[PDB]
Amino acid sequence: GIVLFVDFDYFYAQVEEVLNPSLKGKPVVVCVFSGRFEDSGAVATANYEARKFGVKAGIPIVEAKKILPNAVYLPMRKEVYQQVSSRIMNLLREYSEKIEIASIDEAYLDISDKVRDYREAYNLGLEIKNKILEKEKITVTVGISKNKVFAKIAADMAKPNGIKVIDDEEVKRLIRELDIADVPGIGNITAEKLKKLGINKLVDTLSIEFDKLKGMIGEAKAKYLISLARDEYNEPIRTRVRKSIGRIVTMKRNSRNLEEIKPYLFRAIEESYYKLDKRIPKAIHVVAVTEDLDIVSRGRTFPHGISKETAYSESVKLLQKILEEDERKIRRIGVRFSKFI
DNA sequence: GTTGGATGGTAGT
DNA sequence: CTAACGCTACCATCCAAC
Ligand SMILES: Nc1nc2c(ncn2[C@H]2C[C@H](O)[C@@H](COP(=O)(O)OP(=O)(O)OP(=O)(O)O)O2)c(=O)[nH]1
Ligand SMILES: [Ca+2]
Ligand SMILES: [Ca+2]
Ligand SMILES: [Ca+2]
């Protein structure tokens, strides 16, 4: 079983560099402007030149401009990037039909019926890098291993414009030596909990009672870590089915005034329903980000599908419910559809 | 004692 | 207005309904 994972380099910024080669070789920062005030919002990504200065995905645009004033700041055009992504995804498709698209910029290929071993895998990975570079002028990072998790870990180790194989012996070693925090799915919270039990490496999970481990971090997370640690994790490549779709927007200013909020909510509904496109949801949730950035939410599941008209009516009821049961001012408002038929 | 919908926490973006 | 997008996925906990 061999899995080939491709993850495009500084994707949004790189697309813009391809669309405008004069940008190449300079700091570039792609931004999600919230509309709230001048330069309100956060950064989607930035190129490696910008990262040298601390500018990276997630930080506030005002933090970016503070530490890197003279960079080029462009707004995010997701649709433009999505078009390039789909074209690349189809190139990937001509090397393997067995493909898992995980984000706008990455995908997992099962290549066990195309290559004999890790060498031929690596050569395929160089072939794939070349093709994407010729056809779209995008550089990507390939990670090859016996499974999805390790293909992703391998890519992470080789980022910008690399390629890396983690073969079976290195898996054994990484199960022993890789800091547990560096395992996909273990964030800050879960890392702390694993330190309190003195569990620092994947191998440390095989020397602890299942029941004691599941109590601390949860059943699913325990079964995941133990499975990895046993060298048994083997989730296969499967087409991803979108489970939920929605839209959230930042308001020009905080409010508890229904008539002031409604317009934003109704925009979120229209654009959500456009993104649904054929799908019929049975569950709707209204999501509100309060003045102190806490996320609160009210929803409802129907026994049948939700029509646009019901989405308008219920979302208003749900938003009324949030205002009734929570006293803080609202700052962002959104909606989310799930349980598709 | 067991389902699953409502709500929220954690993760990776 | 004065920092903190916009998104998706998965799972834990609560607690009325079984
Ligand atoms: N809005 C938003 N978009 C993000 C965020 N993180 C990543 N993205 C978008 C922009 C990225 O170009 C694209 C792919 O993200 P990646 O996580 O793979 O990082 P990126 O390609 O930008 O740099 P790379 O060398 O992987 O690290 O997804 C984020 O926090 N917010
Ligand atoms: Ca990625
Ligand atoms: Ca990337
Ligand atoms: Ca971590």
Instruction: Please name each of the domains of chain A with its CATH number.
Output: 2-10+78-166 (3.30.70.270), 11-77 (3.40.1170.60), 167-233 (1.10.150.20), 244-336 (3.30.1490.100)
Specify the residue with its C-alpha closest to ligand 1, atom 2: A44
Q: Is A170 a catalytic residue?
A: no
| A290 CA – B7 C1', rounded, Å | 15
d(CA A149, CA A224): 11
Does the C-beta of A294 come within 7 A of strand C? no
- Contact call for residues A72 and A36 (beta carbons, < 8 A): no
Residues 6+ apart with CB under 8 A from A81: A11, A12, A15, A104
Residue A191 DSSP SS3: helix
Q: For residue A266, give Cα distances in angstroms to A67, A167, A315, A331.
A: 37, 52, 9, 15
Task: Report, in ranges, which bases of strand C sit under 7 Å from a protein C-beta.
Answer: 1-13
Task: Report the C-alpha dihedral over residues A124, A130, A131, A134, rounded to 10 degrees.
Answer: -170
Stated in angstroms to one decimal place, the resolution of this structure is 2.7
> Does residue A159's CB lie within 6 angstroms of at least one atom of ligand 1?
yes
Q: Strand A330-340 and strand A281-290: pairing? A: antiparallel
Ligand 3 center to residue A174 CA distance, Å? 22
> Does residue A5's CB lie within 6 angstroms of at least one atom of ligand 1?
no
d(CA A171, CA A75): 40
Residues pairing with A166 in the sheet: A145
- Contact call for residues A89 and A8 (beta carbons, < 8 A): no
d(CA A177, CA A136): 38
